Design a protein around this ligand. Structure first.
Ligand SMILES: CCCCCCCC/C=C/CCCCCCCC(=O)O[C@@H](COC(=O)CCCCCCCCCCCCCCC)COP(=O)([O-])OCC[N+](C)(C)C
Ligand SMILES: CCCCCCCC/C=C/CCCCCCCC(=O)O[C@@H](COC(=O)CCCCCCCCCCCCCCC)COP(=O)([O-])OCC[N+](C)(C)C
Ligand SMILES: CCCCCCCC/C=C/CCCCCCCC(=O)O[C@@H](COC(=O)CCCCCCCCCCCCCCC)COP(=O)([O-])OCC[N+](C)(C)C
Ligand SMILES: CCCCCCCC/C=C/CCCCCCCC(=O)O[C@@H](COC(=O)CCCCCCCCCCCCCCC)COP(=O)([O-])OCC[N+](C)(C)C
Ligand SMILES: CCCCCCCC/C=C\CCCCCCCC(=O)O[C@@H](COC(=O)CCCCCCCCCCCCCCC)COP(=O)([O-])OCC[N+](C)(C)C
Ligand SMILES: CCCCCCCC/C=C\CCCCCCCC(=O)O[C@@H](COC(=O)CCCCCCCCCCCCCCC)COP(=O)([O-])OCC[N+](C)(C)C
Ligand SMILES: CCCCCCCC/C=C\CCCCCCCC(=O)O[C@@H](COC(=O)CCCCCCCCCCCCCCC)COP(=O)([O-])OCC[N+](C)(C)C
Ligand SMILES: CCCCCCCC/C=C\CCCCCCCC(=O)O[C@@H](COC(=O)CCCCCCCCCCCCCCC)COP(=O)([O-])OCC[N+](C)(C)C
Ligand SMILES: CCCCCCCC/C=C\CCCCCCCC(=O)O[C@@H](COC(=O)CCCCCCCCCCCCCCC)COP(=O)([O-])OCC[N+](C)(C)C
Ligand SMILES: CCCCCCCC/C=C\CCCCCCCC(=O)O[C@@H](COC(=O)CCCCCCCCCCCCCCC)COP(=O)([O-])OCC[N+](C)(C)C
Ligand SMILES: CCCCCCCC/C=C\CCCCCCCC(=O)O[C@@H](COC(=O)CCCCCCCCCCCCCCC)COP(=O)([O-])OCC[N+](C)(C)C
Ligand SMILES: CCCCCCCC/C=C\CCCCCCCC(=O)O[C@@H](COC(=O)CCCCCCCCCCCCCCC)COP(=O)([O-])OCC[N+](C)(C)C
Ligand code: NA
Ligand code: NA
Ligand code: NA
Lengths: 526, 115, 115, 64
């Protein structure tokens, strides 16, 4: 207070390298201004001291383009570390400004403070902004949640959908769903104007487009299976039944054309969705675009099985059979329309990545290790000239140890071995390590994976269904998006229409008299 | 027994029949005509025979024979080992892990449901 | 304290910071700089690093008697000090140890299988 | 603990002129005639707020 009254510059910009750090441990970024330094270090008396000065420009921008409200989003952390002072500094600065000037300002990346919190994954600030309700009369216009009516326990609220719905680019709903960086997407979609907004899209148009997507992919596989199982089978003649080469004048030949034209609709479309999404990360491949590759690998093998018939290499039959078996295992994509089977396909993905791959790494070490030891211990089979041993080669000993683990076949210790006790010592040791140890420990480790993913498998499923809803919406044309549009225009104040969304609520605990309502008459008017 | 059937066993049988009838047509479409040996050249000669031989391989009965009448012998063994990993290693061992979660919740309530 | 496994006294000594001015020299942890939330500290490595004999890091690792060795290595000047050794030289010596033991087995297998 | 025993047994093996090159730490003037070869760790803390005394260096940034 001595320095400000003596004439200190209250608009200085600390723009050094230490204040614009390259890595997170080299410096401290706060917003380059002394108003942002007092706010980011929890000093509310100096914030009130600086905002009373008339020389303080509250809408100034630093070198990144950030203003005071962009900088508080950058330094925000969880309740565990930074308890809650950043959410209370955001409210105090915004009410004294009294405008929408700071909320609607774009930095050098093109983001407002609302779109910057969704980009970085700040779920505690974003919960505050989307549900901001101000009760006082002159500052009620700065809200994003309005009470339409109330009567006793029952009330009816309105949530603003200005930059959170997909009517514009870089909306809040599109940043949260398609964000590869952050690791709490499935917790940020439980927020309230976003949770009802995805439920409204699934009832109006999205469940009907998910059923036409199932029916034309089921008919595609059931007409690929029948033409490949019912081929003309001759040793002298191998006609490809597709493209209808023989002039048999047999109608329903459009099923043979439905495999050609629909293999090109999938290989072109799934090539675009791989091209537009460059993951540059093997974890992002397995977690978001597994079904983009495996719908693309199938549709290529159907096309290559027709180009190899025109060149007659007789390996087209190896490409059709790989396309048939891969295609019926791609019907497990469509279990996300249902909650019961959709949460079951999240368990299958977590068990393979955590438990089954570690088992197969140690098992093949023991399979190929005892396979060479037992094969090197068997004599030459000239004395009986045929069938003296089943462990005569490396390829035969590996096959006989694989049958012994799945339980098939028959065990015979009367081999052609020189050392019959040493053969039985190595064959019982293989049983103890795999039948007793490794296969019984896989069941004990899956019970630990299932116990942790059961807490989270419903929220992970709804993130997988939300990506399906949005990709249907970019497809259908502009005159369909006006008919299936969410919300209704609501006169909030004098000359203010915001296109809100209505949610009802019953509350029995906090009793109070009702003011700050928009409508006196509580009932639904038309 | 009533809670395990409704929650756990019906979801298992839905995914298992998708894999049983899926690999059953792929392996049956890969076997040649049996005129050269005139009898018993393959046990995967039809769709009805390949589905039966994959069901016996899961419950543990029978005997495994890879010397079929297949044109592509490496591709037959790739599809037959992949069937074992998906069912013997994944689905049957995960049914035991999911029943242990159902039993843990119904044990709190099974006396009041009985009365 | 490292010989007997006293993990509460040893946490005190390795991180001893004295704030007063005439007795600051008896510390083993010094604040180099600080600015708001961010700070930077310095941990003394006089008898805890392996430049001498009977160091603290060598007593904790090679102690057969005590039963809390894996809890005493989470202490802070010891946790960063093992992470620094693995990046500089130790992960590269663990990869040459793998390659010449893999080639040893793969040339013992081939000469015994192809006799 | 099993990896730490592997790290240390590699260190007794390599010679004396390699241990000078891969040596940890840096000499720091703590007080008048006191050099202790310390090791630096950074930290961010948001809960205990206080004014800062007892620092060794006034200028916070990394000097070289
Ligand atoms: C089946 C076994 C085959 C096995 C073969 C291998 C397959 C392997 C695995 C397979 C996985 C299981 C099969 C996938 C099926 C998914 C399809 C789907 O989305 O279902 C959905 C409904 O679906 C509907 O749309 C209802 C049907 C009405 C007619 C639709 C025709 C649209 C044209 C008319 C358009 C113009 C008129 C429209 C006016 C606006 C179910 O969604 P839901 O979540 O249950 O809904 C909420 C209900 N709840 C509240 C209780 C939760
Ligand atoms: C191109 C490779 C195809 C398979 C080849 C096998 C070897 C390659 C090795 C593959 C490594 C296996 C790791 C899979 C990683 C995740 C598993 C998974 O998605 O779970 C899914 C179950 O789907 C399954 O059943 C997975 C089993 C894999 C093969 C399926 C049988 C196909 C037959 C093949 C024979 C012909 C082979 C012809 C081609 C060589 C469901 O889980 P999710 O919740 O939906 O997770 C996706 C998340 N996402 C939706 C947002 C994206
Ligand atoms: C550290 C403590 C644990 C380790 C201890 C050892 C440490 C290091 C030692 C290592 C190996 C020392 C033996 C090398 C030579 C023996 C091989 C041999 O001649 O075959 C012998 C088998 O005998 C075996 O099976 C030996 C296999 C290892 C047994 C060691 C105990 C394992 C514990 C399991 C305990 C119960 C199992 C006992 C074994 C069944 C018999 O020979 P033959 O087959 O009859 O050939 C006859 C030839 N003829 C037909 C032409 C006439
Ligand atoms: C994305 C990453 C994962 C997917 C990668 C691929 C992505 C997309 C690709 C898809 C398929 C590409 C190959 C199509 C044509 C090959 C078919 C063929 O000719 O048969 C070949 C078998 O070869 C196979 O078994 C291929 C099966 C798929 C292997 C792909 C790796 C799976 C991972 C598992 C890795 C370990 C397993 C390796 C395979 C055992 C050999 O032919 P044959 O039987 O000897 O016939 C001889 C004919 N004759 C007798 C008349 C003289
Ligand atoms: C034009 C009139 C319709 C009649 C013909 C329909 C022809 C097409 C019907 C079905 C295609 C079958 C899909 C199987 C193969 C997948 C690849 C593919 O090419 O399909 C694509 C088209 O799929 C759809 O978009 C389905 C919805 C129908 C869109 C057409 C109506 C638009 C108007 C709206 C009004 C509707 C009702 C509103 C309610 C009143 C996308 O399929 P996918 O599953 O999303 O992609 C795979 C998933 N993956 C991305 C993770 C890999
Ligand atoms: C037992 C006496 C003898 C048999 C009876 C006689 C035959 C019975 C005939 C029909 C009954 C078959 C079951 C349907 C109802 C199941 C209940 C359910 O929760 O389903 C759920 C998913 O379940 C699915 O629907 C998965 C899709 C698999 C194919 C079945 C399609 C059903 C259409 C029928 C065509 C016939 C197919 C089958 C016929 C061979 C519904 O989805 P959800 O609501 O979003 O999730 C619920 C989770 N929640 C409760 C917490 C919200
Ligand atoms: C389908 C069968 C053929 C597939 C093979 C194709 C190769 C590519 C395979 C898989 C693709 C990439 C692996 C998974 C990607 C990361 C996800 C993950 O969680 O990894 C996990 C598994 O990772 C392992 O450590 C596996 C063990 C060795 C793998 C050897 C190949 C597979 C063995 C079969 C063939 C062996 C023969 C060849 C070997 C030279 C790491 O464990 P985690 O603890 O869960 O870490 C996550 C951290 N978390 C818990 C905090 C979340
Ligand atoms: C889900 C799974 C995904 C991955 C797929 C893998 C799954 C399946 C993997 C493998 C199945 C392979 C079966 C045999 C096929 C070819 C035979 C062959 O090449 O052997 C040749 C060389 O063999 C030798 O000379 C000895 C072996 C050398 C390597 C030592 C093995 C130890 C590796 C342990 C650590 C490695 C693993 C570490 C941990 C990962 C000789 O062939 P033959 O038998 O002598 O033929 C004689 C007949 N003839 C005379 C008529 C010509
Ligand atoms: C016996 C064998 C033959 C029976 C078949 C006769 C058909 C009728 C079958 C059963 C009768 C009706 C189903 C159960 C009724 C509701 C109770 C329930 O909990 O449902 C559960 C299972 O529901 C499923 O999703 C099953 C998976 C698909 C079923 C496909 C047919 C059965 C598979 C075999 C044949 C496949 C071949 C045909 C498929 C086209 C839903 O899961 P949930 O999470 O527990 O939801 C409860 C909510 N809760 C947890 C909060 C409590
Ligand atoms: C608990 C269970 C409750 C439910 C009961 C179910 C349990 C059992 C279910 C089924 C058992 C069936 C066994 C065989 C019975 C009849 C054979 C037949 O009709 O095939 C005929 C057509 O076959 C074809 O042409 C190819 C198959 C077409 C469909 C593709 C299957 C993939 C479905 C995957 C997704 C579907 C499931 C999705 C998930 C649910 C041909 O017969 P054939 O062999 O060629 O005869 C030749 C001999 N002859 C020349 C002398 C004339
Ligand atoms: C219980 C727990 C189960 C765990 C399973 C463990 C996994 C591995 C388990 C077992 C693998 C080994 C067992 C059989 C292989 C050898 C058989 C043999 O006799 O050799 C054969 C050769 O065949 C080959 O050369 C190809 C071998 C690889 C097949 C596919 C690899 C795995 C597929 C990955 C699946 C994708 C994963 C996707 C799933 C999500 C025959 O050749 P031959 O006898 O020498 O004589 C023929 C004449 N010749 C020489 C002229 C040619
Ligand atoms: C001279 C130049 C190198 C070229 C030739 C290398 C020849 C040797 C290479 C590899 C040996 C292979 C080991 C397999 C057999 C184990 C037994 C054995 O005798 O090995 C011993 C040597 O092993 C090592 O120490 C590996 C590290 C290389 C040391 C040589 C470089 C020294 C300079 C440093 C600069 C390096 C780079 C710094 C980064 C810039 C120890 O192996 P172990 O696994 O520890 O013992 C088993 C574990 N157990 C104790 C629990 C039982
Ligand atoms: Na058995
Ligand atoms: Na048997
Ligand atoms: Na269990």
């Amino acid at each position: 207070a001595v320095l400000i009254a003596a004439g200190a510059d209250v608009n200085a910009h600390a723009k050094g390298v230490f204040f614009n750090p390259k890595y997170q441990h080299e410096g401290f970024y706060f917003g380059e201004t002394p108003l942002a330094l007092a706010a980011c270090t929890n000093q509310p008396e100096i914030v009130q001291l600086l905002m009373e000065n008339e020389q303080t420009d509250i809408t100034s921008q630093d070198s990144r383009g950030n203003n005071i409200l962009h900088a508080l989003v950058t330094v925000a952390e969880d309740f565990k570390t930074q308890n809650d002072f950043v959410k209370r500094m955001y409210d105090m600065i915004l009410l004294r400004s009294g405008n929408w000037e700071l909320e609607t300002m774009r930095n050098n990346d093109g983001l407002t403070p609302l779109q910057l919190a969704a980009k970085m994954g700040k779920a505690e600030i974003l919960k505050y902004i989307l549900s901001r309700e101000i009760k006082e009369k002159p500052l009620r216009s700065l809200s994003r949640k309005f009470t339409d009516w109330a009567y006793g326990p029952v009330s009816s609220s309105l949530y603003d959908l200005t930059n959170v719905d997909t009517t514009t680019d870089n909306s809040v709903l599109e940043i949260i769903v398609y964000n590869t960086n952050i690791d709490n997407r499935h917790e940020m979609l439980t927020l309230e104007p976003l949770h009802t907004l995805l439920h409204t899209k699934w009832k109006k148009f999205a469940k009907y487009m998910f059923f036409l997507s199932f029916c034309f992919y089921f008919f595609y596989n059931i007409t690929l299976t029948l033409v490949s199982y019912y081929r003309p089978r001759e040793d002298e003649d191998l006609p490809h039944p597709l493209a209808l080469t023989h002039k048999m004048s047999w109608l329903q030949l459009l099923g043979r054309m439905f495999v050609l034209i629909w293999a090109t609709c999938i290989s072109v479309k799934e090539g675009i969705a791989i091209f537009l999404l460059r993951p540059s990360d093997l974890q992002s491949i397995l977690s978001d675009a597994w079904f983009h590759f495996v719908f693309f690998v199938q549709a290529v093998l159907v096309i290559l099985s027709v180009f190899l018939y025109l060149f007659a290499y007789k390996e087209y039959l190896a490409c059709l059979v790989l396309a048939m078996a891969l295609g019926w295992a791609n019907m497990l994509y469509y279990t996300r329309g249902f909650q019961s089977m959709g949460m079951y396909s999240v368990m299958i993905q977590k068990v393979i990545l955590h438990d089954v791959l570690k088992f197969l790494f140690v098992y093949i070490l023991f399979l190929l290790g005892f396979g060479v030891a037992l094969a090197s211990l068997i004599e030459k089979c000239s004395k009986d000239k045929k069938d003296c041993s089943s462990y005569g080669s490396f390829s035969d000993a590996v096959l006989e140890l694989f049958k012994l683990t799945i339980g098939l076949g028959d065990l015979n210790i009367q081999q052609n071995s020189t050392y019959p006790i040493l053969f039985l010592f190595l064959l019982i040791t293989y049983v103890i390590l795999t039948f007793v140890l490794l296969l019984n420990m896989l069941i004990a480790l899956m019970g630990e994976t299932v116990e942790n993913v059961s807490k989270e498998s419903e929220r992970i499923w709804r993130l997988q269904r939300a990506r399906t809803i949005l990709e249907f919406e970019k497809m259908l044309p502009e005159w369909l998006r006006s008919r299936f549009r969410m919300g209704e225009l609501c006169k909030v104040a004098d000359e203010d229409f915001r296109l809100c969304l209505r949610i009802n609520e019953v509350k029995w605990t906090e009793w109070k008299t009702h003011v700050s309502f928009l409508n006196e008459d509580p009932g639904p008017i038309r």
